[PDB]
Design an enzyme around this catalytic site. Structure first.
Site, PDB file in Angstrom:
ATOM      1  N   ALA A 130       0.776  -1.240   0.000  1.00  0.00           N
ATOM      2  CA  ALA A 130       0.000   0.000   0.000  1.00  0.00           C
ATOM      3  C   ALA A 130       0.811   1.297   0.000  1.00  0.00           C
ATOM      4  O   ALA A 130       0.608   2.158  -0.855  1.00  0.00           O
ATOM      5  CB  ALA A 130      -0.978  -0.001   1.176  1.00  0.00           C
ATOM      6  N   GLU A 131       1.726   1.450   0.952  1.00  0.00           N
ATOM      7  CA  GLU A 131       2.522   2.673   1.017  1.00  0.00           C
ATOM      8  C   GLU A 131       3.420   2.825  -0.208  1.00  0.00           C
ATOM      9  O   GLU A 131       3.609   3.936  -0.715  1.00  0.00           O
ATOM     10  CB  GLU A 131       3.355   2.696   2.302  1.00  0.00           C
ATOM     11  CG  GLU A 131       2.515   2.589   3.577  1.00  0.00           C
ATOM     12  CD  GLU A 131       1.705   3.844   3.892  1.00  0.00           C
ATOM     13  OE1 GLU A 131       1.446   4.658   2.980  1.00  0.00           O
ATOM     14  OE2 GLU A 131       1.309   4.005   5.066  1.00  0.00           O
ATOM     15  N   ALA A 132       3.968   1.712  -0.687  1.00  0.00           N
ATOM     16  CA  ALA A 132       4.827   1.741  -1.870  1.00  0.00           C
ATOM     17  C   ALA A 132       3.996   2.132  -3.096  1.00  0.00           C
ATOM     18  O   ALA A 132       4.486   2.808  -4.000  1.00  0.00           O
ATOM     19  CB  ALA A 132       5.477   0.372  -2.088  1.00  0.00           C
TER      20      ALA A 132
END
EC number: 3.2.2.22
Length: 234
Positions: free
Chosen positions: A169-171
């Site tokens: 998600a963050e990537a």
């Protein structure tokens, strides 16, 4: 369906992220050539397959489409060998009834998971912070093994979820973070740290500016740190 065989091939990792980003933004035009989530997709989900190269075991993650928030995952029951849908404790009441509409292939609804979906509870159950959690291919493979087809404990589930959130998600949201994983997490492990954690917290504020200009200019964060791979609705 976006799928990634958790391995040290950075090309496959990057292609996986682009596939995931596109799924969150399908339906409407891009901004500055970046996909954008839809506010009304709070009841829609994007499924992601994580596969281990060793035994081909598979765990399917489910993300709320409006904000790329992880709500649970699907694996296999050891006694019946059936695909089971597992929801975080704080998402269970709202989604359990429609488990089949979320996890297309689920054969059974399993009991609620031993932890919640929030960053606060995930860190409390895992016993480690977002800042120092060990990230990377090997780290994810180990966490995966402690979860797939076994008895769930708050710690094992929470750790697996946090690593997945960071690497998937963050990537997907931040090109800068994808780059950190490619350079430091394919053959080794690394910790995100305080600055990246603060960067992640500012996804909405950075997204807001992208809707007004494609060239932001340095501020609290650098232009490179602010290079988003997925924009939040405005």
């Amino acid at each position: 369906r976006p799928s990634w065989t958790v391995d040290s091939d950075s090309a496959k990792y990057s292609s996986f992220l682009d596939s995931l980003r596109e799924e969150f933004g399908r339906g409407t035009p891009k901004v500055c050539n970046i996909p954008v989530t839809k506010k009304a997709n709070n009841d829609k989900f994007v499924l992601v397959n994580l596969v281990l190269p060793f035994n081909r075991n598979t765990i399917t993650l489910a993300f709320r489409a409006s904000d790329a928030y992880l709500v649970g995952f699907q694996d296999r029951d050891s006694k019946t060998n059936k695909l089971r849908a597992n929801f975080f404790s704080d998402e269970y009441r709202a989604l359990s009834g429609k488990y089949k509409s979320i996890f297309t292939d689920a054969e059974v609804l399993a009991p609620a998971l031993p932890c919640a979906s929030t960053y606060t509870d995930l860190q409390n159950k895992a016993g480690v912070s977002r800042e120092k959690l060990s990230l990377g291919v090997s780290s994810l493979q180990t966490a995966f093994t402690a979860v797939y087809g076994k008895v769930f404990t708050g710690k094992n589930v929470a750790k697996f979820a946090l690593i997945s959130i960071q690497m998937v998600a963050e990537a997907a949201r931040f090109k800068y973070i994808e780059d950190q994983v490619i350079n430091r997490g394919m053959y080794s492990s690394f910790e995100a740290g305080a600055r990246i954690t603060l960067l992640e917290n500012n996804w909405s504020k950075i997204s807001e500016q992208y809707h007004k200009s494609c060239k932001l200019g340095g501020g609290q964060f650098t232009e490179e740190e602010m290079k988003l791979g997925l924009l939040l609705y405005n």
